[PDB]
Structure formats: C-alpha cells, structure tokens
Amino acid sequence: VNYGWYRVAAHYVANHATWDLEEFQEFLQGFGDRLATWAEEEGYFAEHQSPTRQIFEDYLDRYLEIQGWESDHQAFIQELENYVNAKTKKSKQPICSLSSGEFPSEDQ
RNA sequence: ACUGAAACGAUUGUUGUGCCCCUGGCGGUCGCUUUCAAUGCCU
C-alpha cells in the first residue's frame, strides 16, 4: 500500500495549497517529462522484453494464409505436451482457460 | 488420469395488517261459541 508517498504528496500539495486541480495537472505533466528525461539521461530504466510480438508472429504462421503461400503441418504435439504437464511442477505459468494452451500463457 | 478424480444456488423469512352481511320491516287483515230449549209433571 506504499503509505510513504501519500505523506510526500501531501507536503508538496500543502506547500503549494493555492493550486486548483487543473493548474496542478499542468505541474504534474511537467514533472513527468522531467522524470522521463532524467531517467534516460542516467539510463535507469530497461529495454523491456517483447514476448507478445513473437507469439503473434507464430499465430500468423499457424493460422493465416494468402493463396500461393507455402504451408507446413502444425506440431500438435506441443499442444498435448503442454496439457500433460499443466498440473505438474514443470509448468511455470498456468495453462490458458479460453483455449488449448498451444501458445505461451500467463496469469490472468 | 474420460477437456479426468470429489462437487447442495445455499442459508433465513407468516400473503401480511384492519374490516359488523350491514341497514328497514306489525304474521297482518275480517270473524257473535252461534242456533233451539217451560224447573217441568201431581198434591
């Protein structure tokens, strides 16, 4: 619940108590852009992963066809292998509740 | 392991509370217990 920041904010809002909500939002938009520039001049944030692009490129490769595309037989073994292990310690995230689990899944 | 193995939409609850089959009403009207009779017969 990170109670400490509510004390920080309440000091800045008490010191500048003359503000209304809209001239406050004009402050905080400038505070965010300072934070953004400062974070990337120091390099203090990561180039985070891109997993949904990869599984989406593989979703297209299984299920989209234009006439005259080359096509392969799907490896349905991976869809069974993921079900056979869905309740076994060697599965890291839960299996999909809306589908078979042939693509990587994550908690809802 | 049947997309599996076990699997209570459940618990509690008043169709309730008030209510005059009520008000008005003459068993009424007409009607002779009537009609006839020797306290009699003799001293």
Q: How far is the CA of A8 from the C1' of B23 (A)?
A: 86
76-105 on A, CB < 7 Å from strand B: 86-87
Largest CA distance in chain A: 69
Phi (first) and psi of residue A98, to 5 degrees: -105, 0
Would you say A94 and A83 are in contact if contact means Cβ atoms under 8 Å apart? no
Structure tokens at A99: 């589908």
Resolution reading in Å: 2.9
Would you say A82 and A92 are in contact if contact means Cβ atoms under 8 Å apart? no
Which residue, chain included where needed, has tokens 């985070």? A48
CA distance A58 to A50: 14
Q: How far is the CA of A78 from the C1' of B17 (A)?
A: 70
User: CA end-to-end span of chain A, whole Å?
Assistant: 21
Please give the method by which this entry was determined: cryo-EM
Q: Which nucleotides of B are covered by protein (CB under 7 A)?
A: 1, 4-5
CA distance A106 to A83: 15
What stretches of A16-95 show up as alpha helix (H) in DSSP?
21-42, 51-63, 77-84
Would you say A79 and A101 are in contact if contact means Cβ atoms under 8 Å apart? yes
Structure tokens at A5: 């920041």
Contacts of A24 (CB under 8 A, 6+ apart): A13
Which residue, chain included where needed, has tokens 């944030």? A45
Structure tokens at A55: 């599984």
